[PDB]
Amino acid sequence: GNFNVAHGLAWSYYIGYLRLILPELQARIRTYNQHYNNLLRGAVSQRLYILLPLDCGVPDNLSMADPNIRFLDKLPQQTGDRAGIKDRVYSNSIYELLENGQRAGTCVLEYATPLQTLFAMSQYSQAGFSREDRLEQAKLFCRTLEDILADAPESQNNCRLIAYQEPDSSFSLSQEVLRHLRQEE
Amino acid sequence: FNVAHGLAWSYYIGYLRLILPELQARIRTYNQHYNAVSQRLYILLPLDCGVPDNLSMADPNIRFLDKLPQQTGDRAGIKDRVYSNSIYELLENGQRAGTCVLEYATPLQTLFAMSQYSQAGFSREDRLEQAKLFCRTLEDILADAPESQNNCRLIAYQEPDDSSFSLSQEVLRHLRQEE
Ligand SMILES: Nc1nc2c(ncn2[C@@H]2O[C@@H]3COP(=O)(O)O[C@H]4[C@@H](O)[C@H](n5cc(-c6ccc(-c7ccccc7)cc6)c6c(N)ncnc65)O[C@@H]4COP(=O)(O)O[C@@H]2[C@@H]3O)c(=O)[nH]1
Prior knowledge:
Chain A is an alpha/beta fold and 185 residues long. Chain A is 41% helix and 25% strand. The first copy, chain A, contains four helices and seven strands, in the order H-E-E-E-E-E-E-H-H-E-H. In chain A, strands 2-5-6-1-7 form a five-stranded mixed beta sheet. A two-stranded antiparallel sheet of chain A has the order 3-4. In chain A, strand 5 and strand 6 (102-111) form a beta hairpin. The longest helix of chain A has 35 residues, at 2-36. The N and C termini of chain A lie far apart (40 Å). The interface between A and B is large, with 51 and 52 residues. Ligand KWO sits between chains B (10-11, 14-15, 75-76, 78, 81, 83-84, 106-107, 110) and A (12-13, 16-17, 85, 88, 90, 110, 113-114, 117). Chain B: This is Stimulator of interferon genes protein.
């Protein structure tokens, strides 16, 4: 039950998003860094950072949560004709991570959108899922996504999953991403 | 408590509930002096999960006419995330017989891809059952969201090398019945 739901969303996240964008991402980041960002310490990192809040709380504005996360720019758009929709575009947003009034990191950052479906399905009676089902579904989504990416040809050190339990006044989202960014080289 | 339920709720929560409230107004912004499209989104639900990215590949009598004005929304850390819809003309005897906003349900293409990947654990018999569950679940969601139900028509069909079936003729039947 909680397995089959998470399993389906994780695969849909891969087939309809990650497998299509991850192959070209490093070229899009490289082009951006070469032409638009000649800051020797302000380079966009080479990986998509995907935020997996395990409570499934996904704000549509990622900057609002944390004064130390500021929207910088959009990467160059990627467009595809998909199921009779001409030029279905994929956009990715670059964010500035601030630490002690200084820029500490710059990366392509987003939430995993499917967690918003797990939240909704816990809220609507017709879906038939409790809040304890949603936590199990969030965990199994993360584990299934990690398992897909481990054997995926399009995952070439170009994707990092960031999972955390904090929904909070003692939690810094910028600090959470900065710890992952700094661990890599 | 299955794959189709998650795909159905994702289709509603992540697409239909956000574009259908604005669709009729986007039409107007297309319906200009030089521009007779119906004000409903036509969603094709092929149970075989055979979803061509180009609708003209399925039936040569469906031809791309134009894109409707792009819808943008800030979504889950992505600002200016665009939602795009295509207008198609339906030919009858080489001449336009109808125009509508037409597309396949994208999640059925995921069920198809999932049936191709060994790691997904999904047989071809599992895919048909989940295709059917996807359609049934989406319909029950929209039957409790009439703000969305009056703005889209769901067309679920099974195509057994069956030359007796014309997708253009089937959509034209629904368009003329509506009117
Ligand atoms: N982060 C990011 N995730 C993406 C993007 N694409 C796709 N996924 C995610 O990959 C999984 C599989 O995608 P599918 O294609 O299989 O199923 C879709 C499709 O049927 C229909 N649908 C959805 C969109 C759409 C989806 C997400 C975004 C978005 C953009 C930025 C941040 C957050 C979300 C924008 C649009 C869509 C569209 N723009 N035009 C026509 N139809 C569409 O609704 C279904 C559920 O959508 P979902 O729950 O939002 O997220 C989907 C889904 O979880 C992307 O560009 N960005």
